[PDB]
């Protein structure tokens, strides 16, 4: 199905006009997009349009997240109060309803990014430096604190969901909120239980123990997912990576390694970077409904940067 005629002008719900260009990268139904003008949408376009049938659940979930939490000025306000260089939550530009060939579709206009981190990781023989991992993780902690404080949990952090700013290789953004989860609607935390609405478990190698136990994701699970990403990034591996077809094996391993983090460090690393063990110990202390002390997690990571004779200079080193 072609959802658009290439070069057509589409008008969103706020009457802003956009033009549609070609598909990106040979992701889903995602096309380059720009402000309506007399020029064609070029390969250096600054936006994308994501389009799915209107009965698609994930696009609707994602749209709601972006409308509630990613409004250009909502993000800018947070950046000013927190004295952040930037925030890696993509900006929402608009959305609408588009009918074609008697089918109804939903569309959403978003920032356009450069490469995902997974491609860059594979081009570096599946390693990121200690400097890179700490700098990424600091910015992901900023992002997670933001979304959590706006009642959502991502539940699927991974290098393929981390995109670089098209104009700035040192700024990383977390994308894909189609299976994001509003753990705290109206300040009321979800109970330790399954959500019948939700069916997703994250990505098996990175997902949280809570997710493996069949309960809805919460804040600690996001921090836990980031922990496993860090190890994967530093080492090229996770202990359970050859048994991903067997979830109960993966859960058993995660549960045992949480109970004994020094054995995780022994398995994954001779000498391990101490911030990682410290990070995971702090995450382990969290109850299901407990608010993380994000600034203490960031501190733990800053002490890793000090230990390699560096600082938080915002350099990803990719």
Kindly state whether residues 99 and 246 are assigned to the same domain.
no
CATH number at residue 317: 1.10.510.10
Q: In angstroms, rounded to a whole number, what is the distance separating the alpha carbons of residues 25 and 38?
A: 25
Q: In angstroms, rounded to a whole number, what is the distance separating the alpha carbons of residues 298 and 311?
A: 12
Q: Which of 12, 111, 116, 156 is catalytic?
A: 156
Q: Is 214 helix (H, G, I), strand (E, B) or coil?
A: coil
- To one decimal place, what's the resolution in Å? 2.1
H or E segment and range at residue 263: helix 261-268
Kindly state whether residues 279 and 138 are assigned to the same domain.
yes
Kindly state whether residues 299 and 185 are assigned to the same domain.
yes
Q: In angstroms, rounded to a whole number, what is the distance separating the alpha carbons of residues 119 and 124?
A: 9
Q: How was this structure determined?
A: X-ray
Q: In angstroms, rounded to a whole number, what is the distance separating the alpha carbons of residues 219 and 259?
A: 19
The answer for residues whose C-beta is within 8 angstroms of residue 212's C-beta and 6 or more apart is 201, 247, 250, 251, 254
Kindly state whether residues 90 and 33 are assigned to the same domain.
yes
H or E segment and range at residue 81: helix 72-82
Angle of helix 261-268 relative to helix 219-235, nearest 10 degrees, comes to 30
Q: Is 54 helix (H, G, I), strand (E, B) or coil?
A: coil
Q: In angstroms, rounded to a whole number, what is the distance separating the alpha carbons of residues 264 and 231?
A: 10
- Cα dihedral angle (73, 79, 82, 84), rounded to 10 degrees? 180
Kindly state whether residues 78 and 147 are assigned to the same domain.
no
Question: Known binder of ligand: residue 25?
Answer: yes
Q: In angstroms, rounded to a whole number, what is the distance separating the alpha carbons of residues 269 and 156?
A: 24
Rg, Å, the chain Cα set: 20
Question: Known binder of ligand: residue 206?
Answer: no
Q: Is 244 helix (H, G, I), strand (E, B) or coil?
A: coil
Question: What does each C-alpha distance from 294 to 53, 137, 178 come to in angstroms?
Answer: 38, 12, 25
Tokens of 150: 């706006």
Kindly state whether residues 292 and 173 are assigned to the same domain.
yes
Question: Known binder of ligand: residue 30?
Answer: yes
210 is catalytic: no
- The parent domain of residue 296 ranges over 114-318
Tokens of 196: 């019948």
Kindly state whether residues 94 and 76 are assigned to the same domain.
yes
Kindly state whether residues 181 and 247 are assigned to the same domain.
yes
Kindly state whether residues 202 and 160 are assigned to the same domain.
yes
Residue 303 CB neighbours (<10 A): 13
Kindly state whether residues 120 and 248 are assigned to the same domain.
yes
Q: Is 42 exposed, middle or buried (0-12, 13-18, 19+ CB in 10 A)?
A: exposed
Give φ, ψ of 49 to 5 degrees: -115, 130
Q: In angstroms, rounded to a whole number, what is the distance separating the alpha carbons of residues 168 and 22?
A: 23
Give φ, ψ of 162 to 5 degrees: -120, 115
Looking at the structure of the chain, the number of domains it has is 2
Kindly state whether residues 279 and 150 are assigned to the same domain.
yes
């Amino acid at each position: 199905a072609e959802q658009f005629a290439v070069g057509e002008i589409i008008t969103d719900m706020a009457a802003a006009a956009w033009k549609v260009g070609l598909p990106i990268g040979q992701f889903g139904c995602i096309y380059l997009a720009d402000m309506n003008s007399s020029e064609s949408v070029g390969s250096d376009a600054p936006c994308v349009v994501k389009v799915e049938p209107s009965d698609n659940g994930p696009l609707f979930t994602e749209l709601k997240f972006y409308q509630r939490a990613a409004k250009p000025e909502q993000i800018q306000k947070w950046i000013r109060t927190r004295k952040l260089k930037y925030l890696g939550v993509p900006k929402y530009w608009g959305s609408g309803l588009h009918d074609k060939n008697g089918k109804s579709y939903r569309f959403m206009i978003m920032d356009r990014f450069g490469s995902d981190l997974q491609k860059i990781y594979e081009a570096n023989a599946k390693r990121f430096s200690r400097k890179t991992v700490l700098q990424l993780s600091l910015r992901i902690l900023d992002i997670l604190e933001y979304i959590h404080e706006h009642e959502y949990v991502h539940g699927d952090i991974k290098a393929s969901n981390l995109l670089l700013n098209y104009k700035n290789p040192d700024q990383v953004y977390l994308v894909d909120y189609g299976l994001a989860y509003r753990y705290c609607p109206e300040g009321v935390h979800k109970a330790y239980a399954a959500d019948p609405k939700r069916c997703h478990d994250g990505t098996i190698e990175f997902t949280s123990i809570d997710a493996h136990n069949g309960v809805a994701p919460s804040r600690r699970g996001d921090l836990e997912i980031l922990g496993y990403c860090m190890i994967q990034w530093l080492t090229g591996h996770l202990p359970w990576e050859d048994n991903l077809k067997d979830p109960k094996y993966v859960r058993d391993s995660k549960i045992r390694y949480r109970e004994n983090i020094a054995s995780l460090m022994d398995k994954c690393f001779a000498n391990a970077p101490g911030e990682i063990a410290k990070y995971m110990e702090t995450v382990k202390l969290l109850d299901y409904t407990e608010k993380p002390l994000y600034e203490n997690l960031r501190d733990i990571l800053l002490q890793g940067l000090k230990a390699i004779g560096s600082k938080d200079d915002g350099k990803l080193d990719l």
